[PDB]
């Protein structure tokens, strides 16, 4: 994660000064969000695979996902390893204030802690900005079932 | 006034959004038992945990268990509360397992169960949705005077 | 052309002065500008 | 509202150990967990009967007709 | 730690002087201050606090003659209308020998252009075929008390000091 | 950073208020409207600085002082309260003059002078 | 806003869906459900 | 691709949202030739081709003076000269040109004269001029040269017209398609609209799981046919 | 002995002197102590048109006390009013000045109706009852109060939330409907609502009292701004991108040949509706339409139309910025854009209109004796007061009981204003308080007001919401919140000029968009040169308590504005001030807070803590824990678990669960049954589910210590073996013990009331 936090911080400092080349469908802000969202989505895969390959036999949620009972291998990962990016409407967490998402982060911050990447597991227990960012994506899918 | 006891079909819940109904009532020599002889009041399925990801219910049981063995009420307040690594200190202090999993015997066949059973006190609350106030049935009865349907 | 006259600062709408030379002259103000040759840019 | 007579999970009689539980805490005071063990409540199903018992009969009896 | 002190002094209150703000004329032309609109036929309306300055503009430079004389009755002078609203804590300051002298500015006028001759061409062009509401009814029903013009009054420069001296 | 930018611009307005006050000396009939607070301290009795701080006109003269500090700054004190000062209105574009009104029968609009700029004084809260 | 004759026929509480396509029936009951593995799937 | 994608096929929606149009090219390897045919279907407004739009007010002549370049014309390789732009201005007729008055100054400039208030209509013609379409099809909003997963170049035109795109040179008109089922009906008949209803529903549901049997879709295609 | 983990003791210090039902209790205390006077003074005098000398004026008003009595009146206690199906109320003693015969007479203590008073407010007899007087009056001391007893049924007025009233909000979509609301509301002097729309790239001005909409250049000329260069300097500035967008609107003023304010006012004078009474001219009407008709909170009183012209110019600058960049729009769902209308505000709307209709129906019967014979036989004019005084009582009681809100004068027809208080749990009675209703429950959208916003951190509970048809439209307020009290703003305006703004009538309109302009409640006031020195000296006057708290100032930057809000209905939240990288509340203050002295609101007066608005949290940077305080911080959380409300504090370890799970508990903690009250055996209610042996949770929470949940708990500690057993527990069924049920595990009890009234008849 600290590699992913260091690579995402060597990518915004190339963005505050205008330097980032873009994919041919996006501008410089949107091509940041693909390089910074596609890099947080690969450390659920890195840290998730370190999890599931490590839990022993006669692990209970590993049996209930090998069966096809209640459980996915992602649900087990979020309870043990990183819960991961809280995607809201396809994007990250929107700026709920003037130029940041939440007053506990500095203004003009695109750091992954600030835009919705929760790192504590459910066993670890979610931090107070991690708690709210996960709670927004919960209701966004709780009203998408009504 | 009316007194009423749990029937098949009353709703109980824990404090973790896991609503549930009473499916069977079991004779207490058929329940599993530990070395001290404690039998459960509720048996809860392990299949309501992985899809729902209520890990804070797995900590309510240990903090509930270590607290009642210590004699103190514990705390599960948000962003804090009692810690799992020293609720598991009280729990080895007695001679229970640190993880809250006990070796229960089987009440039906007498044998050791082949898994350790996660076992302790959860706070259950009983809901107002009771099957006595919900079971109804009609053969023939009054009809609406306009449509002459039931 | 978005150019405002002196002394009342209304909009200098240009007009065909008595079927002759174009002049830009304010309305409700007797200011005028006879022989302009003026232009603008808009990229 | 008043103490259960028996533990729910064993049937061990715990209703006679509420009047004596409060005396071990009020006088000769103990730390609520050796006052349980002194009354002889080993099993945790039986300790939770009187530890988490909230006694509401004392508050309900304040509102009767004075009679 | 200071160096010098300027004797901030105040003047009296028997003047009720006003200040003017010409919303059209800029202050600068070529980094020098622009020249004052020279001659005026000023008039004032008490109980409504209206200032009307009549600044005549020059002919023969950018001034047409057929336009003004045909329908606007041949006007050559511009009326500037503004309202004097009070604003407290305002003070004029001339400085003599490193001493400022505060004089209480009583009202501030926001002088904007005005067109009397459209009102002339409003009444005289319909008669062929033919709360704050009160604050305008008091305005138009009162005769605008004319004030003669005076430029370069140096007696006020001494009038503050003779009542500062006590 | 923004409080440092307003600090140096006030430091820029403190030399710019000293030139435009010293150059304006003894040029006759040329004024400067400048803004004081509405309520002033009392002068029959001196209201002390912290008492005027709390609740937030006919006068004689020599009621204050415009002190020039050695470092770069200026500060008006009146009576005993200490205020701060800055050329803080705007670079005005509309042209300004001062006209004296006369009441009833000597009816005249005396044109006194022309406004240089506008400086403001605030209590040092 | 009284009901006319057209107001008795409109809406999902009127006649066409509310008395003709859907209607309360007899010899029916409604009860909370509950599991039983011992009885057959039919 | 949601359930409102189904809901706009299920009823015959004349105006759908996002009506993208595939197109197959005869030059699937030359990148420059892909850019040639891309500009031929893409509409080009006058703003992207000009330097400036001005007007000069000499003593009796008043004219809109438009200067364009040729350094844009070779970068985005349009087959556009300075003359048919002046044709395309007169072609527009949303601005009442009385089109015999257009003059062309040498190689870089077009003078739109006007003569009879004269200022009101010349002000309105000042801003309604630099957004007219000078080359391309008017209902095509945008186009994207897309690389297929074998490397081939099949551009995603995103407008309304299919007859115009399938007749554009470079685009082979046998293999170009459209999301819009009513617009396939106007050019390709009913039987290529039946075959397109069942292919936009075997593609909308198949992006969400939903392994419906295809014979349940073919019968839905035929009720609409 | 004291450290970083001890600052949460401010949360029992906050809730001690405040409580959780203060948003009901303070509002009703404000109404019966301040707003009763500001209704009597708004219509004091009764003017008899027949013989214009028999006037009648009301001197003052008070409820529940006669002036000659040194003691408050005896009220029937609130529990007896539940049993006897009465209304728990208090008499409204007005005293009256009237004319009788040939002299004027004051009469004292006229009872005009009865006011249904709220429980635990000032006039309730439960106010300062020492829990032994609660038992004599058969009342539960753990009851929250905050509700009314009307015809026996106990009714709660829910917290309504509206959009922010007197401020500007920018909407936009494709097809270019860039509209700008401003719902002006001076109480009902006028209740009006303007728009600003761009049609065809041309800015207009729609208003519902105009026949057809007016363009924008010939309405600034209707105000004083007529120079037509400054209109290009009030809405464009020196920005060349905006000068192109507005330039179409200039020539349209010349196209109608409008050039003076005389001619500009006469345009809109012939565009009005409701010409009724005066037969005044179109000049006298068009100058009245700018007076008190378009933007009604900005009433003009004289010739100077300057600040109102600057208002419409700063509306249309936000339109031109929205046309250029389409993302400069305002969120309608942002919590700073909301106002919470409480129970005193609603009853002041309700009691005023009944006192209008009292005085109208008393005037049209005070002349039914004057123009009739027996001229020499005078009458005291105080014998027909009780003819209509049973409409004050019956109209207050009906509108609370039915919940219907039929205000003829104010023109609002709201439904669902009240609800029956829930007596399912102890949690239901406290979850029905702190509950917030919304305006979206008439027309439907997707993914708008139902998604929670990040701007409700600490203001609203992030999990307590129903699931189903109201998910995100009903919401709940957190623990440490406060609703702002509306206060006077002209002392706050006069503080702004002293602190260094210079007035809008003093500033040039050319150089207005080069300096930050201050905005006292959305209205432009001045223009400061140095804003962050101005804002810092305004917090410093608030932290010293010179200017009040609940007065928020925040310096926007993209708008380049300094807003100052002081109106009521904003949601505050207390925070600890930090300074130069160091929390200002030291361990000496927590040592004093514990041992009795120096309570909460001594942390406000001594400058230690601070209420922050939602908007003022933009101009901040808040630490969560003391270990996270960097030098650029400016606040610190008192306690992070107050992100959750009262009901969501029942959950043990919520941060370990998944978030949809913590929302289902909030709906199901209100449905679980246990103990209700201490008079739960003395009450006769419609349906009352009780539990025989309720136990307090083994794992508890600080949040349920605070709300006293462990003294009336709802549940039992079951011994739970998490295992798969019998195949009768497959999908959420649970296996139960028979010998537990025989001993009283989960055994409940139902109670039901049955009322008959032996009515006597007219026969
Ligand atoms: Zn002019
Ligand atoms: Zn028992
Ligand atoms: Zn037991």
Swiss-Prot record, chain C:
Q: Which domain of life is it from?
A: Eukaryota
Residues engaged in binding Zn(2+) 1: 5, 8, 26, 29
User: Start and end residues of each C4-type zinc finger?
Assistant: 5-29
Q: Where in the cell is it found?
A: Nucleus, Nucleolus
Which family does the record claim for this protein? Belongs to the archaeal RpoM/eukaryotic RPA12/RPB9/RPC11 RNA polymerase family.
| UniProt function note | DNA-dependent RNA polymerase catalyzes the transcription of DNA into RNA using the four ribonucleoside triphosphates as substrates. Component of RNA polymerase III which synthesizes small RNAs, such as 5S rRNA and tRNAs. Involved in Pol III transcription reinitiation and RNA cleavage during transcription termination.
Task: Spell out the subunit comment.
Answer: Component of the RNA polymerase III (Pol III) complex consisting of 17 subunits.
Q: Which protein are we looking at?
A: DNA-directed RNA polymerase III subunit RPC10
In its UniProt entry, the species of origin is given as Saccharomyces cerevisiae (strain ATCC 204508 / S288c) (Baker's yeast)
**Covered residues, full protein:** 1 to 43 of 110
UniProtKB/Swiss-Prot annotation, chain F:
Q: So what does this one do?
A: DNA-dependent RNA polymerase catalyzes the transcription of DNA into RNA using the four ribonucleoside triphosphates as substrates. Specific peripheric component of RNA polymerase III which synthesizes small RNAs, such as 5S rRNA and tRNAs. Essential for tRNA synthesis. The RPC53/RPC4-RPC37/RPC5 subcomplex is required for terminator recognition and reinitiation.
Question: Its quaternary structure?
Answer: Component of the RNA polymerase III (Pol III) complex consisting of 17 subunits. Interacts with RPC37/RPC5. RPC53/RPC4, RPC37/RPC5 and RPC11/RPC10 probably form a Pol III subcomplex.
What domain of life does the UniProt record list for this protein's source? Eukaryota
What subcellular locations does the record give? Nucleus
Q: Which residues of the full protein are shown?
A: 274 to 422 of 422
Family stated for the protein in its record: Belongs to the eukaryotic RPC4/POLR3D RNA polymerase subunit family.
- This protein is called DNA-directed RNA polymerase III subunit RPC4
**Further comment found in the protein's record:** Present with 998 molecules/cell in log phase SD medium.
Name the species this protein comes from: Saccharomyces cerevisiae (strain ATCC 204508 / S288c)
Curated annotation (Swiss-Prot), chain G:
Something else known: Present with 6020 molecules/cell in log phase SD medium.
Q: Which organism is it from?
A: Saccharomyces cerevisiae (strain ATCC 204508 / S288c)
Q: Which family does it belong to?
A: Belongs to the RNA polymerase beta' chain family.
Name recorded for this polypeptide: DNA-directed RNA polymerase III subunit RPC1
Q: What does this protein do?
A: DNA-dependent RNA polymerase catalyzes the transcription of DNA into RNA using the four ribonucleoside triphosphates as substrates. Largest and catalytic core component of RNA polymerase III which synthesizes small RNAs, such as 5S rRNA and tRNAs. Forms the polymerase active center together with the second largest subunit. A single-stranded DNA template strand of the promoter is positioned within the central active site cleft of Pol III.
Q: Which domain of life is it from?
A: Eukaryota
Compartment(s): Nucleus
Give the record's subunit note.
Component of the RNA polymerase III (Pol III) complex consisting of 17 subunits.
Source taxonomy lineage? Eukaryota, Fungi, Dikarya, Ascomycota, Saccharomycotina
From Swiss-Prot, chain I:
UniProt keywords (A-Z) are: DNA-directed RNA polymerase, Metal-binding, Nucleotidyltransferase, Nucleus, Transcription, Transferase, Zinc, Zinc-finger
Recorded GO cellular component terms are: mitochondrion; nucleoplasm; nucleus; RNA polymerase III complex
Coarse class of the primary localization is nucleus
S-S bridge residues: none
**Entry's localization field:** Nucleus
Q: What is its EC number?
A: 2.7.7.6
Biological process terms in GO annotation: termination of RNA polymerase III transcription; transcription by RNA polymerase III; transcription initiation at RNA polymerase III promoter; tRNA transcription by RNA polymerase III
Lineage top rank: taxon = Eukaryota
Reactions that this protein is recorded to catalyse: RNA(n) + a ribonucleoside 5'-triphosphate = RNA(n+1) + diphosphate
Which molecular-function annotation in GO is an example for this chain? ribonucleoside binding
Give the first-level EC class, as a single word: transferase
- Keyword Membrane in record: no
Miscellaneous notes for this chain?
A: Present with 1950 molecules/cell in log phase SD medium.
Assembly information from the UniProt record: Component of the RNA polymerase III (Pol III) complex consisting of 17 subunits.
Family label: Belongs to the RNA polymerase beta chain family.
The job of this chain, per UniProt, is described as:
DNA-dependent RNA polymerase catalyzes the transcription of DNA into RNA using the four ribonucleoside triphosphates as substrates. Second largest core component of RNA polymerase III which synthesizes small RNAs, such as 5S rRNA and tRNAs. Proposed to contribute to the polymerase catalytic activity and forms the polymerase active center together with the largest subunit. Pol III is composed of mobile elements and RPC2 is part of the core element with the central large cleft and probably a clamp element that moves to open and close the cleft.
């Amino acid at each position: 994660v600290e590699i992913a936090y260091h690579k995402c911080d060597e990518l915004i400092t190339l963005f505050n000064k205008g330097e980032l080349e873009t994919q041919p469908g996006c501008n410089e802000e949107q091509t940041l969000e693909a390089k910074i969202g596609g890099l947080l989505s690969k450390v659920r895969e890195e840290v998730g695979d370190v999890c599931i390959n490590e839990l022993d036999n006669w692990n209970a949620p590993l049996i209930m996902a090998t069966c096809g009972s209640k459980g996915s291998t992602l649900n087990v990962s979020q309870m043990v390893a990183v819960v991961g990016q809280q995607i809201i409407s396809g994007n990250r967490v929107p700026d709920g204030f003037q130029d940041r998402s939440l007053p506990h982060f500095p203004k003009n911050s695109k750091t992954p802690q600030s835009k919705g990447f929760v790192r504590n597991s459910f066993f670890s227990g979610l931090s107070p900005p991690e708690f709210l960012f996960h709670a927004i994506s919960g209701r966004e899918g709780l009203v998408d079932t009504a | 006034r009316q007194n009423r006891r749990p029937e098949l079909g009353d709703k109980f819940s824990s404090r973790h959004g896991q609503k549930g109904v009473c499916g069977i009532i079991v004779k207490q020599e058929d329940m599993p038992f530990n070395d001290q002889g404690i039998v459960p009041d509720i048996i809860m399925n392990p299949h309501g945990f992985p899809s729902r990801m209520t890990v804070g219910k797995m900590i309510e049981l240990i903090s509930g268990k270590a607290g009642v063995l210590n004699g103190t009420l514990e705390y599960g307040t948000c962003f804090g509360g009692s810690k799992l690594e020293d609720m598991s200190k009280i729990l080895v202090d007695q001679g229970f397992n640190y993880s809250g999993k006990d070796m229960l015997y089987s009440g039906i066949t007498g044998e050791c169960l082949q898994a350790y059973i996660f076992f302790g006190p959860i706070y259950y609350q009983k809901l107002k949705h009771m099957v006595l106030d919900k079971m109804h049935a009609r053969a023939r009865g009054p009809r609406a005077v306009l449509t002459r349907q039931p | 052309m978005l150019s405002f006259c002196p002394s009342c600062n209304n909009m200098l709408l240009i007009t065909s002065g008595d079927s002759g030379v174009y002049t830009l002259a304010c309305r409700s103000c007797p200011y005028e500008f006879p022989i302009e040759g003026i232009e603008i840019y808009d990229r | 509202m008043i103490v259960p007579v028996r533990c729910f999970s064993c049937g061990k009689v715990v209703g006679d150990k509420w009047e004596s539980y409060l005396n071990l805490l009020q006088e000769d005071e103990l730390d609520e967990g050796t006052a349980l063990s002194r009354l002889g409540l080993k099993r945790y199903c039986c300790r939770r009967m009187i530890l988490t018992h909230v006694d509401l009969i004392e508050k309900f009896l304040r509102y009767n007709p004075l009679e | 730690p200071v160096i010098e002190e300027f004797p901030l002094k105040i003047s009296g209150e028997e003047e009720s002087l006003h200040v003017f703000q010409y919303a059209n004329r800029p202050r600068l032309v070529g980094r020098k201050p622009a020249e004052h609109p020279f001659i005026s036929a000023a008039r004032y309306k008490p109980k409504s606090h209206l200032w009307e300055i009549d600044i005549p503009l020059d002919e023969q430079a950018f001034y047409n003659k057929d336009k003004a004389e045909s329908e606007w009755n041949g006007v050559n002078v511009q009326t500037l209308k503004g309202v004097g609203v009070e604003n407290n804590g305002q003070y004029a300051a001339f400085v003599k020998d490193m001493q400022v002298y505060l004089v209480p500015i009583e009202r501030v006028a926001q002088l904007k252009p005005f067109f009397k001759y459209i009102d002339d061409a409003n009444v005289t062009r319909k008669q062929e075929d033919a709360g704050s509401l009160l604050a305008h009814k008091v305005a138009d029903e009162e005769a605008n008390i004319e004030l003669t013009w005076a430029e370069g009054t140096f007696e006020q420069f001494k009038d503050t000091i003779v009542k500062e001296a006590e | 950073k923004e409080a440092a930018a307003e600090l140096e611009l006030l430091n820029a307005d403190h030399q710019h208020i000293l030139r435009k006050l010293k150059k304006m000396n003894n040029k006759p009939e040329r004024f400067m409207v400048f803004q004081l607070p509405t309520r002033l301290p009392a002068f029959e009795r001196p209201a002390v600085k912290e008492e005027k701080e709390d609740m937030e006109r006919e006068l004689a003269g020599k009621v204050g002082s415009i002190r020039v500090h050695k470092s770069g700054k200026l500060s008006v004190k009146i009576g005993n309260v200490v205020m701060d000062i800055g050329k803080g209105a705007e670079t005005t574009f509309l042209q300004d003059v001062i006209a004296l009104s006369i009441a009833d029968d000597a009816s005249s609009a005396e044109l006194l002078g022309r406004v240089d700029g506008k400086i403001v004084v605030t209590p040092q809260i | 806003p009284i009901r006319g004759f057209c107001q008795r026929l409109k809406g999902k509480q009127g006649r066409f869906r509310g008395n003709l396509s859907g209607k309360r029936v007899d010899f029916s009951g409604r009860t909370v459900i509950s599991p039983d593995p011992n009885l057959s799937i039919d | 691709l949601g359930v409102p994608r189904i809901k706009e096929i299920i009823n015959a929606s004349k105006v759908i949202s996002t009506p993208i149009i595939n197109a197959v090219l005869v030059n699937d390897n030359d990148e420059r030739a892909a850019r040639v045919v891309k500009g031929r279907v893409e509409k080009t407004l006058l703003s992207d081709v000009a330097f400036y739009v001005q007007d000069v007010y000499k003593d009796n002549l008043s004219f809109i003076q438009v200067r364009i370049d040729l350094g844009t014309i070779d970068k985005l390789q349009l087959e556009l000269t300075i003359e048919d732009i002046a044709v395309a201005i007169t072609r527009a007729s949303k601005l009442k040109i009385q089109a015999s008055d257009v003059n062309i100054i040498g190689k870089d400039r077009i003078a739109i004269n006007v003569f009879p208030d004269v200022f009101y209509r010349m002000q309105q013609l000042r801003r309604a001029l630099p957004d007219v379409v000078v080359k391309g099809l008017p209902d095509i909003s945008r186009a994207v040269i897309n690389i297929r997963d074998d490397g081939k170049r099949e551009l995603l035109v995103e407008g309304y017209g299919l007859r115009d795109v399938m007749c554009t040179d470079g685009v082979i008109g046998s293999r170009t398609t459209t999301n819009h089922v009513l617009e396939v009906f106007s050019v390709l008949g009913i039987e290529a609209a039946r075959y397109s209803i069942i292919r936009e529903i075997n593609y909308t549901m198949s992006n969400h799981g939903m392994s419906v049997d295809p014979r349940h879709i073919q019968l839905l295609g035929d009720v609409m046919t | 002995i004291n450290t970083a983990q001890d600052k949460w003791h401010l949360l029992p210090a906050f809730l001690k002197v405040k409580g959780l039902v203060k948003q009901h209790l303070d509002s009703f205390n404000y109404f019966v102590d301040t707003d009763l006077k500001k209704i009597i003074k708004a219509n004091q005098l009764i003017l008899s048109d027949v013989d214009p000398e028999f006037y009648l004026k009301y001197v003052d008003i008070r409820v529940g006390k006669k002036s000659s009595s040194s003691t408050k009146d005896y009220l029937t206690p609130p529990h007896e009013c539940r049993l006897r199906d009465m209304t728990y109320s208090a008499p409204i003693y007005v005293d009256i000045e009237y004319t009788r015969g040939r002299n004027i007479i004051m009469h004292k203590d006229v009872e005009i109706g009865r006011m249904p008073i709220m429980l635990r407010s000032n006039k309730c007899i439960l106010y300062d009852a020492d829990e032994s007087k609660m038992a004599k009056l058969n009342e539960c001391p753990l009851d929250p109060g905050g509700y009314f007893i009307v015809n026996g049924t106990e009714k709660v007025i829910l917290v309504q939330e509206q959009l922010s009233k007197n401020r500007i909000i920018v909407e936009a979509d494709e097809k270019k409907g860039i509209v700008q609301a401003s719902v002006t509301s001076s109480t009902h002097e006028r209740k009006s609502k303007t728009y600003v729309i761009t049609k065809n790239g041309k800015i207009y001005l729609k208003h519902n009292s105009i026949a057809e909409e007016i363009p924008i250049a010939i309405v600034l000329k209707a105000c004083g701004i007529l120079s037509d260069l400054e209109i290009m300097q009030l809405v464009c500035g020196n920005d060349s991108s905006y000068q192109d967008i507005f330039a179409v609107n200039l020539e349209e003023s010349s196209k109608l040949d409008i050039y003076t304010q005389q001619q500009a006012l006469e345009y809109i004078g012939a565009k009005v509706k409701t010409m009724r009474r005066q037969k005044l001219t179109i000049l006298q009407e068009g100058i009245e339409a700018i007076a008190t008709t378009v933007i009604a909170h900005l009433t003009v009183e004289a010739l100077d139309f300057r600040e109102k012209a600057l208002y419409i110019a700063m509306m249309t600058r936000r339109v031109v910025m929205a046309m250029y960049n389409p993302k400069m729009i305002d969120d309608r769902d942002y919590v700073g854009n909301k106002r919470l209308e409480l129970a005193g505000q609603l009853i002041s709307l309700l009691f005023e209109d009944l006192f209008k209709k009292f005085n109208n129906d008393f005037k049209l019967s005070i002349d039914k004796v004057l123009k009739k014979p027996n001229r020499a036989m005078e009458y005291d004019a105080l014998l027909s007061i009780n003819v209509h005084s049973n409409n004050i009582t019956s109209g207050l009681n009906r509108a609370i009981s039915t919940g219907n809100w039929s205000l003829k004068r104010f023109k609002m027809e709201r439904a669902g204003v009240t609800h029956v208080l829930s007596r399912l749990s102890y949690i239901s009675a406290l979850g029905m308080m702190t509950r917030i209703s919304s305006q979206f429950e008439k027309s439907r959208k997707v993914s708008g007001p139902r998604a929670l916003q990040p701007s409700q951190f600490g203001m609203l509970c992030t999990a307590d919401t129903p699931e189903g048809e109201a998910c995100g439209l009903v919401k709940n307020l957190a623990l440490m919140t406060h609703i702002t009290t509306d206060d006077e703003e002209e002392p706050i305006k006069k503080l702004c000029y002293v602190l260094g703004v210079e007035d809008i009538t003093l500033i040039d309109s050319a150089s207005l968009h080069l300096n930050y302009g201050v905005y006292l409640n959305g209205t432009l006031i001045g223009s400061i040169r140095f804003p962050t020195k101005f804002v810092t000296q305004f917090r410093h006057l608030r932290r010293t308590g010179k200017v009040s708290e609940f007065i928020s100032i925040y310096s926007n930057s993209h708008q380049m504005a300094v807003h100052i809000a002081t109106d009521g209905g904003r949601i505050c939240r207390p925070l600890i001030i930090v300074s130069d990288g160091q929390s200002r509340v030291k361990d000496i203050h927590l040592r004093k807070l514990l041992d009795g002295e120096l309570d909460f609101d001594d942390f406000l007066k001594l400058g230690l803590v601070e209420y922050l608005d939602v908007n003022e949290e933009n101009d901040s940077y808040i630490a969560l824990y003391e270990k996270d305080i960097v030098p650029s911080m400016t606040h610190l959380e008192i306690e992070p678990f107050t992100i959750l409300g009262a009901v969501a504090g029942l959950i043990p370890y919520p941060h370990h669960n998944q978030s949809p799970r913590n929302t289902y508990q909030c709906a199901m903690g209100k449905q679980a049954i246990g103990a209700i009250a201490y008079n739960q055996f003395k009450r006769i209610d419609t349906l009352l589910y009780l539990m025989t042996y309720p136990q307090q949770p083994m794992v508890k929470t600080k949040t349920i210590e605070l709300i006293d949940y462990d003294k009336l708990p709802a549940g039992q500690n079951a011994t739970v073996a998490v295992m798969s057993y019998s195949g009768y527990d497959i999908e959420d069924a649970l296996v139960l013990n028979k010998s537990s049920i025989d001993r009283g595990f989960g055994r409940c009890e139902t109670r039901r009331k049955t009322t008959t009234v032996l009515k006597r008849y007219a026969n």
